[PDB]
Write a protein that binds this ligand. Structure first.
Ligand SMILES: Cc1cc2nc3c(=O)[nH]c(=O)nc-3n(C[C@H](O)[C@H](O)[C@H](O)COP(=O)(O)OP(=O)(O)OC[C@H]3O[C@@H](n4cnc5c(N)ncnc54)[C@H](O)[C@@H]3O)c2cc1C
Ligand SMILES: NC(=O)c1ccc[n+]([C@@H]2O[C@H](COP(=O)([O-])OP(=O)(O)OC[C@H]3O[C@@H](n4cnc5c(N)ncnc54)[C@H](OP(=O)(O)O)[C@@H]3O)[C@@H](O)[C@H]2O)c1
Ligand SMILES: Cc1cc2nc3c(=O)[nH]c(=O)nc-3n(C[C@H](O)[C@H](O)[C@H](O)COP(=O)(O)O)c2cc1C
Length: 609
């Protein structure tokens, strides 16, 4: 429970702001959009600020009308089971319980979500609906960003209509480059005051002190890092992180987050192509001395450290980044292409989508392919988004491994249409960790994916490929429960891989669990061992009769882990078909039945894409 700042409205009054944009963000996307809208205000003669709702009391919204022509915008992402982001949970709870009168308040909401998930943009939709129920008036339509298509474009389209709507309503009206930070180079800086990759307090990585979390990650020693797949088509790995003496608690189903380091070669080349000295110690200080965000990342620090541990230099740059960088491209045609990247349609948009996004060109690739583009290193560092932690489904049970967190991951490495080979940041970094000291900054995030409280409750686990991760923890635990003399209900695993001799993960361990009876059934779909595809859902359909018995009569809990794009939906459709045949009942009622299981905690998801 953080200590709330004083009234954001009073802050706005003292700083001359009329627009405030709150971000409900988990991996920084909403935060970036909010910063962009906040900065846009200036171009229309207004003034804005972005803010984390967790740091404030949104009840002060009722005082916003005290500021003339005021407006509040919410850029909100949705997470686990249509829930708010962790930083927006307090606001969400307040919205549900409050009865405050928001008459006079003007608002707009841009939701960030993904159509492949169950509750698409649930948080954005809720906030938009609730503020109106409380008496506030909507100044622009709810934006529904879909990350399954192209979120950046949905944001661009919405933003392009939003500002004119705001200008028309408030009777205001609308061209230069403005920086948020000023560069301060430090000649004789004490090393003790220089950040070298820590996320929170200076030297927190060196002097570890609990409790450990996102702000203060625990550096866990990699005690094991072995190749899991038999073949060489890809690289799947098993890692074991030593969390001894960290006081960290976890359960099977939770997630472990890690803070990686970017590839040194990429960092070196960015500095090289820009002709910058990456070992310069500096700070980027907010030109707005009132803001709580004094720096874009921990400072003072060297550009090398920033590019390595604090900045995202691998994902396709967003349109505002390319737009601001255009000024540094001396070739007219290149300046024109970069400027047009922010277009909401036409050739400029088509180029952004194909040449930047589809081609997966990162910032270095763009600097190389538009050779006249040579921005100063300090401004680039202010423009780049923050390097995010990566989440992995803990693949161990704390009942069996209380002092170790296991990770099952596939290394990301692919040929992009940009012509170069792109490497996943976290997986390339983890793959290179050699036991005995290889340390990994991490923390555990509690999830709602959990084994049944009653050991006798049957469990149906569906997790092809790396989706098997949490289930290794589940199986370890259920096995442990049997070894403890407890009565354990049926435990069925529906796993899938390409070929038994290519990438059958944990083949030996699973064989052992099956032989010992920890696994009532080990159903494996080898998708490429025959001409037709054989997937986990084909096996579920095969066992429809028994599964229905377990679900309708045995109160079984279903778990689906892995690909959220196609697998999760195909599996869900199969469960619909099963319920529809044995209920019996029409598709519509089958869908409703399965939806209910989810609300009753008997159908859990741990999917990603
Ligand atoms: C809740 C949750 C649980 C997860 N559990 C696990 C897990 O247990 N095991 C696991 O392996 N992963 C899991 N992940 C995924 C993991 O967090 C990372 O996204 C993954 O390891 C890649 O990270 P990276 O830094 O190596 O790659 P990044 O540098 O982040 O690159 C990822 C991006 O590469 C691009 N890309 C990948 N392949 C291609 C391609 N062939 N063509 C074009 N683009 C491509 C995509 O845009 C992808 O988003 C989980 C994610 C979430 C959210
Ligand atoms: O990377 P990763 O860990 O996700 O592993 P992955 O190897 O990409 O996928 C794991 C297994 O899931 C199969 N699969 C692909 N599409 C599926 C679908 N729509 N429904 C059910 N299974 C599907 C894959 O088969 P194919 O790759 O052979 O389709 C493979 O056998
Ligand atoms: C574990 C996980 C769960 C998600 N659950 C949902 C969901 O229920 N509904 C939805 O619309 N989008 C969901 N998304 C997609 C995000 O809302 C979308 O990617 C958003 O752009 C993330 O914004 P952020 O970076 O500001 O947190 C999920 C993403 C992850 C990684």
């Amino acid at each position: 429970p953080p200590v709330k700042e004083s009234s954001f409205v009073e802050k706005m009054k003292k700083t001359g702001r009329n627009i405030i944009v709150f971000y409900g963000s988990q991996t920084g996307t909403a935060e970036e959009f909010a910063n962009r809208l906040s900065k846009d205000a200036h171009r229309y003669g207004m003034r804005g600020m972005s803010a984390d709702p967790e740091e404030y009391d949104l009840a002060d919204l009722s005082s916003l009308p005290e500021i003339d022509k005021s407006l509040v915008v919410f850029c909100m992402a949705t997470y686990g089971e249509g829930d708010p982001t962790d930083n927006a949970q307090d606001f969400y709870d307040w919205l549900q319980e409050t009865d405050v009168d928001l008459t006079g308040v003007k608002f707009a909401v841009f939701g960030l979500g993904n159509k492949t998930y169950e509750h698409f943009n649930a948080m954005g939709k809720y906030v938009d609906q609730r503020l109106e129920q409380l008496g506030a008036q909507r100044i622009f339509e709810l934006g529904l960003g879909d990350d399954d298509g192209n979120l950046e474009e949905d944001f661009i389209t919405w933003r392009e209509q939003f500002w004119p709507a705001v200008c028309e309503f408030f009777g205001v009206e609308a061209e230069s480059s403005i920086r948020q930070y000023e560069l301060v180079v430090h000649e004789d800086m004490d090393v003790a005051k220089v950040y070298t990759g820590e996320m929170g307090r200076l030297k927190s990585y060196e002097n570890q002190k609990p409790p450990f979390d996102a702000k203060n990650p625990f550096l866990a020693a990699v005690t094991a890092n072995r190749k899991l797949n038999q073949g060489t088509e890809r690289h799947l790995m098993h890692l074991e992180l030593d969390i001894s003496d960290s006081k960290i608690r976890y359960e099977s189903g939770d997630h472990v987050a890690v803070y990686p380091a970017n590839d040194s070669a990429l960092v070196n080349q960015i500095g090289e192509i820009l002709g910058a000295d990456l070992d310069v110690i500096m700070s980027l200080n907010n030109l707005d001395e009132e803001s709580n965000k004094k720096h874009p990342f921990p400072c003072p620090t060297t550009y090398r450290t920033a590019l390595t541990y604090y900045l995202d230099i691998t994902n396709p740059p967003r349109t505002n980044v390319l737009y601001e960088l255009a000024q540094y491209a001396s070739e007219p045609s290149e300046q024109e292409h970069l400027h047009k990247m922010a277009s909401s349609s036409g050739e400029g948009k088509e180029l952004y989508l194909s040449w930047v996004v589809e081609a997966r060109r990162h910032i270095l690739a763009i600097l190389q392919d538009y050779p006249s583009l040579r921005p100063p290193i300090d401004h680039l560092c202010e423009l780049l988004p923050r390097l995010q932690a990566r989440y992995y489904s803990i693949a161990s049970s704390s009942k069996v491994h209380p002092n170790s967190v296991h990770i099952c991951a596939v290394a990301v490495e692919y040929e992009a249409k940009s012509g170069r080979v792109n490497k996943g940041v976290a997986t390339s970094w983890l793959r290179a960790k050699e036991p005995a000291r290889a340390l990994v900054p991490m923390f555990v995030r509690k999830s709602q994916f959990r084994l049944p409280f009653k050991s006798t409750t049957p469990v149906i686990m569906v997790g092809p490929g790396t989706g098997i991760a949490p289930f290794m923890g589940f199986i370890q635990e259920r096995a442990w429960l049997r070894e403890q003399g407890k009565e354990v209900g049926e435990t069925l695993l529906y796993y899938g891989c390409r070929r038994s001799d290519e990438d059958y993960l944990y083949r030996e361990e699973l064989a052992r669990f099956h032989k010992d009876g920890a696994l009532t059934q080990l159903n494996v779909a080898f998708s490429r061992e025959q001409a037709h595809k054989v997937y986990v859902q084909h096996l579920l359909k095969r066992d429809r009769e028994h599964l229905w018995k377990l679900i309708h009569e045995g109160g079984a809990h279903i778990y689906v882990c892995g690909d959220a794009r196609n697998m999760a939906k195909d599996v869900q459709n199969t469960f619909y078909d099963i319920v529809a045949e044995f209920g019996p009942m029409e598709h519509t009622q089958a869908v409703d039945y399965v939806k209910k299981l989810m609300t009753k905690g008997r159908y859990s998801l741990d999917v990603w894409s």
